[PDB]
Amino acid sequence: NGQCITKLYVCDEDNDCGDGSDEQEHLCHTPEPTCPPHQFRCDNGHCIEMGTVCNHVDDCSDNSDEKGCGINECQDSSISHCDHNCTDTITSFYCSCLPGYKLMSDKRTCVDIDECKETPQLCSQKCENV
Amino acid sequence: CDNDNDCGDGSDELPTVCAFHTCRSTAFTCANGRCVPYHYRCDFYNDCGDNSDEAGCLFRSCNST
Ligand SMILES: *[C@@H]1O[C@H](CO)[C@@H](O)[C@H](O)[C@H]1NC(C)=O
Ligand SMILES: *[C@@H]1O[C@H](CO)[C@@H](O)[C@H](O)[C@H]1NC(C)=O
Ligand SMILES: *[C@@H]1O[C@H](CO)[C@H](O)[C@H](O)[C@H]1NC(C)=O
Ligand SMILES: *[C@@H]1O[C@H](CO)[C@H](O)[C@H](O)[C@H]1NC(C)=O
Ligand SMILES: *[C@@H]1O[C@H](CO)[C@H](O)[C@H](O)[C@H]1NC(C)=O
Ligand SMILES: [Ca+2]
Ligand SMILES: [Ca+2]
Ligand SMILES: [Ca+2]
Ligand SMILES: [Ca+2]
Ligand SMILES: [Ca+2]
Structure with missing residues (x-):
């Protein structure tokens, strides 16, 4: 619009x-980068054709492509000691909590969101956590 | 191997090929003659x-x- 603002102001909501x-969203945030939808991404910043991930040959620099293919972790309680729900993947697995709960850095434990403290605008007068 | x-x-x-085998020294070494990166x-x-890579750790x- 033809205005000058201090650099600190450029992204502060x-x-x-x-x-x-x-x-502006493109200025303030970076979308997680990906690759063609016909492909696959390992842990390292590499993208390979998806068929290769389970070909018994190590593709990623960290060899993490082939590691997961054989295990249905949700059926194996030892690895998948998840608190609410588990879903398999051709590599590794993902774990998720019920609505109103949040996940912790072990990516398995679930905890209760204090919705009042996290989003005080939810209730117009008073809020109580359950 | x-x-x-x-x-x-x-x-x-078979032993006559694998007998003297070793793997890149930075990788972990396992009881059954198998190697995985140390992490x-x-x-x-x-x-x-088996379970010798997981066994014993807290x-x-x-x-x-
Ligand atoms: C997730 O886990 C909870 C608690 O065990 C259960 O009530 C719910 O049905 C599960 N949902 C799915 C989609 O597995
Ligand atoms: C703990 O999490 C913070 C971010 O919340 C991170 O910066 C830090 O490195 C983490 N520390 C450990 C020991 O994982
Ligand atoms: C975009 O994401 C990367 C990681 O993928 C960095 O966290 C970077 O700081 C992000 N940039 C902005 C502007 O948030
Ligand atoms: C992933 O990122 C690439 C490179 O930016 C492409 O934009 C691709 O369309 C993206 N795919 C997804 C899943 O968003
Ligand atoms: C394997 O390790 C042994 C030590 O027991 C020797 O260093 C040998 O030279 C190694 N061979 C290779 C290159 O795997
Ligand atoms: Ca601003
Ligand atoms: Ca592969
Ligand atoms: Ca899996
Ligand atoms: Ca073999
Ligand atoms: Ca292991």
């Missing part, structure tokens, strides 16, 4: 520039 | 055969900070 150029 | 019967009837893993050790996956797995 406030429309200091009235056009809303400041706070 | 990955300790798998890849060549049909186990012909690739693989004790990550709840039995990447090596599974401390959370951000103590």
Whole structure:
């Protein structure tokens, strides 16, 4: 819009520039990068054709492509000691908590969101966590 | 020498080829003659055969900070 704002203002969740150029999503946030949808991404920043992931040959620099293919972790309680729900993947698995709960860095434990503290605007007068 | 019967009837893993085998020294070494990168050790996956890669470790797995 033809305005100058201090660099700190450029991304702080406030429309200091009235056009809303400041706070633009492409400026303030970076989408997780991916690769063609016909492909696959290992842990390292590498992308390979998906058929290769289970070909018994190590593709990723960390050899993590072939590791998961043989295990249905949700059926194996030892690895999948998840608290609410588990889903298999051709490599590894993912774990998720019920609505109203959040997941912890072990990617298996679940904990209760204090919705009042995390989002006070939910209730117009008073909020109580359950 | 990955300790798998890849060549049909186990012909690739025979002692007369694998007997003196060793693997890149930075990788972990496992009781059954199989090697996985050291970080693989004790990550709840039995990447090596049986359980000797996981066996004996305390599974401390959370951000103590
Ligand atoms: C997730 O786990 C909870 C608790 O065990 C269960 O009530 C719910 O049905 C599960 N959902 C799915 C989709 O497996
Ligand atoms: C704990 O999490 C913070 C981010 O919340 C991270 O910066 C830190 O490296 C983590 N520490 C450990 C020991 O995992
Ligand atoms: C975009 O994501 C990368 C990691 O993939 C970095 O965290 C980077 O700091 C992000 N950039 C912005 C502007 O948030
Ligand atoms: C993943 O990222 C690539 C490179 O940016 C492409 O944009 C691709 O379309 C993306 N796919 C997904 C899943 O968003
Ligand atoms: C394997 O390790 C042994 C030690 O027992 C020797 O260093 C030998 O030269 C190694 N051979 C290779 C290159 O695997
Ligand atoms: Ca701003
Ligand atoms: Ca592969
Ligand atoms: Ca899996
Ligand atoms: Ca073999
Ligand atoms: Ca392991």
